[PDB]
Design a protein around this ligand. Structure first.
Ligand SMILES: CC(C)(COP(=O)(O)OP(=O)(O)OC[C@H]1O[C@@H](n2cnc3c(N)ncnc32)[C@H](O)[C@H]1OP(=O)(O)O)[C@@H](O)C(=O)NCCC(=O)NCCSC(=O)c1ccccc1C#N
Ligand SMILES: CC(C)(COP(=O)(O)OP(=O)(O)OC[C@H]1O[C@@H](n2cnc3c(N)ncnc32)[C@H](O)[C@H]1OP(=O)(O)O)[C@@H](O)C(=O)NCCC(=O)NCCSC(=O)c1ccccc1C#N
Ligand SMILES: Cc1cc2c3c(c1C)C(C)(C)C[C@@H](O)N3c1c(nc(O)[nH]c1=O)N2C[C@H](O)[C@H](O)[C@H](O)COP(=O)(O)O
Ligand SMILES: Cc1cc2c3c(c1C)C(C)(C)C[C@@H](O)N3c1c(nc(O)[nH]c1=O)N2C[C@H](O)[C@H](O)[C@H](O)COP(=O)(O)O
Ligand SMILES: [Ca+2]
Ligand SMILES: [Ca+2]
Ligand SMILES: [Fe+3]
Ligand SMILES: [Fe+3]
Ligand SMILES: [Fe+3]
Ligand SMILES: [Fe+3]
Ligand SMILES: [K+]
Ligand SMILES: [K+]
Lengths: 514, 514
């Protein structure tokens, strides 16, 4: 029982074969060093640390999804558009997970039912020097079967184990875990779930999804979507101490129960002062320094893992990195594309959630109007995206003559193609927002800065598309960059010099001559 | 009379000494090849073409201001902020131009008072294959003395000489030339002016300015500002056939008279169909394909130039390039900074007009609120900038923890720091706009698409700053990128690989660890 099928170790072997893996044997400190090195090489190749300070049994990998190109190469996609379309198709066609025996699951080689000190086995890290606690943010929640209406859910939840085998469990209001906890908020028994660490890359990719429940509602099969993404079923295994299932090919597994009504503070400082929304926790998805809140507790009852001599791998990652941004926004883009295609097929050409747009904060859709009867569909798309993606603050629609991956080109569209009196939608003022946005959280006023007091401003949908029938007046003409060859005029040396001095919007403008 | 003092040739020598000059002897075609090569290397080093097709007496340089770094090095500035502050100081302290004798002016070595075929001596170019005419867009208008209220004006004006020695003269409504023509629209005598070609780089830098007349009103000394920028007075010389002055150190000079009431069409096609706003002319500053209009005529009476064996240099440049963008937006940024400093000193920290913002289209100001009594000044600044910069469509204010040069960071500020119900200003709906913006020009409806029928939407001022006293809640925390050294963990080879895979917002985030 020591082989993961399409597991993280196979991905590491593939990275090493492609030359995309950077290893080191120097001992890395989980306190400020892993996240520091990840931010120094933000959006770069994966880094594998063989020696982690005070964790002789663990290896740490980071920047696994830092470069979207290497991720697309790992999953067999040509480019971002191909990835979006293939992931939408996978969302509509899940692969049912397969259950294997308890004696052939690689993640159950070692089963600790006592001596449950999570902080001794799972690597907790500190992101910034301003933090006080070391937290665990590498595990994905896994709920399979009756508690998810016969489907399966996988997603990240940050945990702070400050009571040995009991830690806080951060749940986004409105998410799948929030819906499960709300349905069972007044039950007598706790919710049995497991946290998986070092899972297969497809499971991480699908766990990044969130707040796309018009496409992935409660009862869907997220593990099935991961299996369809990886081209084969994901293996499940029955837990040892609870009635649930786990990812058999993970590296660590925490079995336990979620107590919805047993809420405790995430940090000792906030627990002392007894207020939420202040007292920094660590950097969050909106790009701001974090805050600490009360949260339900996760009561661990068993710690399963691979053979400790094999040094099971854990994937710790800073929040404000290209890694986390890719992990969330990839399936977010695919789900937004699927929704727009459901509403009216053939109009949306591409969807992109750039790193700068705060994974749950905004998105960009590219629409192509084929005739006069399709004019106005971009506004329906913007309203539907803002309403079906809770707390999304800025959705932008652009035409097909726009480079959706260049923020400079988007800014140009905003400057030249937006009528400020009619092209700025504010669909749902007073709806549900995201508490982690400081602009929204500051609307609490003098109340507790939690989700119960914030007041959403309604989002912002910007229609920066060209009106149909005015494509000649809004034409970005072309420069003749294909009609002349620089080799006829200069030598290779000068051409390389001039090319090396180029960066930014000019790279996009020179490719298209636009 | 054959030495320009701080002239274009001295700048070429400096570029060659610094290794920033790329030369070639292959004959370049002014039709689609110069602009094509400039767009292939957009924002790169200057290119000098020694042989121009059908112009055996002329040399052509392009991308002279393509790289703002080489421009700042040429003028002796450390960075863009230093450039902005120094240029504001120069705006407030002009150097009076000096007049030299007619026999020592390098630009008057050859004086052609007959055989005035402008197209035979001045290199006209075609930008895109969609155009029909070859136009002259390398000369700057120069009005000195009584017709500019004792001051001096320099600025670009595109000319199409389709009547031998008479060509159209494109004038922006509201500009300095527009104000001069409006003051003398009903005079009997024409307006005597000269067009200078291959002028000193400081004169090009100052001619790029426009629509900043709260700082550079009619009657100012723009040539004095150029002299102050270059650190020495600009030399003037009395014209030969008219009562005016010219830049003595230019390469070509066209003396003549501007006939405000003698308006003709810019292209034969639009003249035939007899409509304006259609019938493409060439790419304009807003990044769109151009249109042709009626315009006053410039009646040339003499063509002065340097010795034709010296091959005088001409500076043709495509409109939608980093070159033109720098040329305009540099002094635009300095003037906006000066205005904001006049209104309330010490609040604005930096001003930037990115390439993506359509030189007259938008700007970004960075404000730092020092106390509670300064909260709200960013809105005064935005309103004043939108009102005193005619036709500006999008002004954005950001806080001091923002990278003003990264469009991704600006998009992040837009996503997380903008209240759509209170932070989007629309100050002056129905005011004066820019006819060359298609979004504005399409408001003409069924009328002629000219400046007489467009209806401005009012501009858009976005207050994306952090409210004072909430700097802890809007804190972009920091990652510990200075506390760990990658050399201790990896070798130089892997570090260079990981660094080479990085580009875009990650370069800004990794420098600040933010
Ligand atoms: C809002 C909440 C939780 C509430 O807590 P509070 O505002 O303090 O109010 P409350 O809970 O005490 O009272 C409430 C009363 O409503 C009844 N009630 C309460 N809940 C339920 C329920 N589920 N079902 C049925 N009834 C319920 C109770 O009956 C009664 O409560 P009880 O009397 O029973 O105790 C509040 O604490 C709170 O955490 N905000 C913040 C939570 C939040 O944004 N995370 C987002 C996580 S994204 C994230 O990280 C991330 C994502 C991507 C990338 C990086 C990162 C990072 N890095
Ligand atoms: C609007 C206009 C000119 C008017 O023309 P029209 O709309 O057709 O109306 P109109 O002139 O025939 O009539 C008008 C009537 O108002 C009276 N009147 C008219 N003018 C005056 C005056 N100055 N003073 C006193 N009275 C005056 C006349 O008394 C009567 O005219 P008359 O009867 O006497 O003839 C119209 O033609 C027109 O060109 N729009 C477009 C012009 C325009 O945006 N360029 C912007 C140039 S930025 C540029 O390139 C650029 C910049 C940076 C980087 C790259 C690039 C590029 N690449
Ligand atoms: C990639 C990644 C994502 C998340 C988190 C982290 C990482 C690295 C932590 C570092 C652990 C910090 C926090 N964290 C986190 C979180 N969602 C929560 O509800 N609670 C959390 O504490 N998301 C977003 C999740 O990935 C979403 O999937 C979300 O949980 C909704 O998913 P779903 O219900 O729709 O399936
Ligand atoms: C750098 C550059 C600027 C301009 C132009 C060109 C270049 C290369 C052409 C290729 C020739 C095409 C056009 N053109 C142009 C123009 N302004 C006009 O009123 N008319 C014009 O046809 N500007 C902007 C001018 O540089 C401004 O200075 C403007 O003229 C206002 O200046 P001012 O009155 O405030 O002094
Ligand atoms: Ca993305
Ligand atoms: Ca600029
Ligand atoms: Fe889920
Ligand atoms: Fe629009
Ligand atoms: Fe002027
Ligand atoms: Fe604001
Ligand atoms: K998920
Ligand atoms: K000027």
């Amino acid at each position: 029982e020591r082989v993961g099928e399409k597991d993280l170790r196979a991905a590491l072997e593939w990275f090493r074969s492609k030359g995309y893996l950077v290893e080191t044997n120097k001992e890395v400190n989980p306190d400020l060093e892993i996240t520091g090195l990840q931010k120094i090489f933000d959006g770069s190749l994966p880094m594998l640390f063989n020696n982690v300070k005070d964790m002789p049994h663990a290896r740490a990998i980071t920047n696994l999804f830092g470069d979207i190109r290497v991720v697309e190469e790992l999953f067999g996609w040509e480019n971002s558009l191909d990835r979006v379309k293939k992931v939408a198709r996978a969302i509509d066609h899940p692969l049912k997970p397969v259950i294997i025996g308890q004696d052939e699951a690689p993640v159950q080689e070692e089963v600790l039912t006592t001596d449950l000190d999570v902080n001794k086995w799972l690597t907790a890290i500190r992101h910034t020097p301003l933090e006080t606690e070391m937290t665990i943010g590498s595990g994905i929640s896994c709920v399979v079967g009756p508690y998810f209406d016969g489907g399966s859910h996988i997603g990240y939840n940050r945990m702070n184990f400050r009571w040995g085998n009991v830690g806080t469990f951060q749940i986004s209001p409105g998410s799948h875990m929030w819906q499960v906890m709300t349905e069972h908020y007044k039950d007598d028994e706790p919710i049995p779930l497991t946290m998986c660490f070092g899972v297969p890359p497809s499971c991480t990719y699908v766990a990044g999804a969130g707040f796309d429940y018009a496409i992935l509602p409660k009862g869907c099969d997220e593990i099935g979507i991961a299996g369809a993404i990886q081209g084969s079923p994901v293996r499940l295994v029955k837990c040892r101490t609870i009635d649930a299932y786990t990812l058999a090919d993970a590296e660590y597994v925490l079995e336990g129960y979620l107590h919805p009504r047993d809420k405790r503070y995430e940090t000792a400082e906030s627990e002392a002062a007894d207020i939420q929304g202040r007292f920094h926790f660590h950097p969050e998805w909106a790009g701001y320094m974090g805050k600490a809140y009360k949260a339900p507790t996760f009561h661990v009852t068993a710690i399963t893992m691979r053979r400790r001599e094999s040094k099971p791998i854990i994937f710790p990652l800073g929040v404000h990195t290209a890694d986390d941004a890719n992990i969330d926004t990839s399936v977010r883009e695919s789900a937004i594309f699927a929704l727009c295609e459901r509403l009216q097929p053939g109009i949306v050409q591409n969807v992109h959630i750039p790193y700068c747009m705060t994974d749950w904060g905004g998105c960009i859709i590219q629409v192509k109007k084929r005739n006069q009867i399709e004019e106005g569909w971009q506004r329906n798309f913007l309203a539907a995206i803002l309403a079906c993606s809770q707390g999304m603050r800025l959705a932008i629609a652009v035409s097909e003559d726009v480079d959706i991956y260049s923020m400079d080109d988007i800014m140009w569209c905003l400057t030249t193609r937006v009528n400020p009196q009619t092209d700025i939608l504010n669909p749902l003022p007073g709806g549900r927002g995201q508490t982690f946005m400081p602009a929204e959280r500051m609307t609490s006023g003098d109340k507790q800065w939690t989700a119960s007091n914030t007041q959403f401003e309604g989002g912002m949908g910007i229609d920066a598309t060209v009106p149909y029938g005015y494509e000649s007046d809004f034409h970005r003409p072309v420069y003749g960059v294909d009609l002349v060859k620089p080799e006829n005029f200069f030598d290779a040396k000068d051409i390389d010099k001039m090319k090396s001095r180029m960066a930014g919007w000019v790279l996009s403008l020179a490719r298209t001559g636009r």
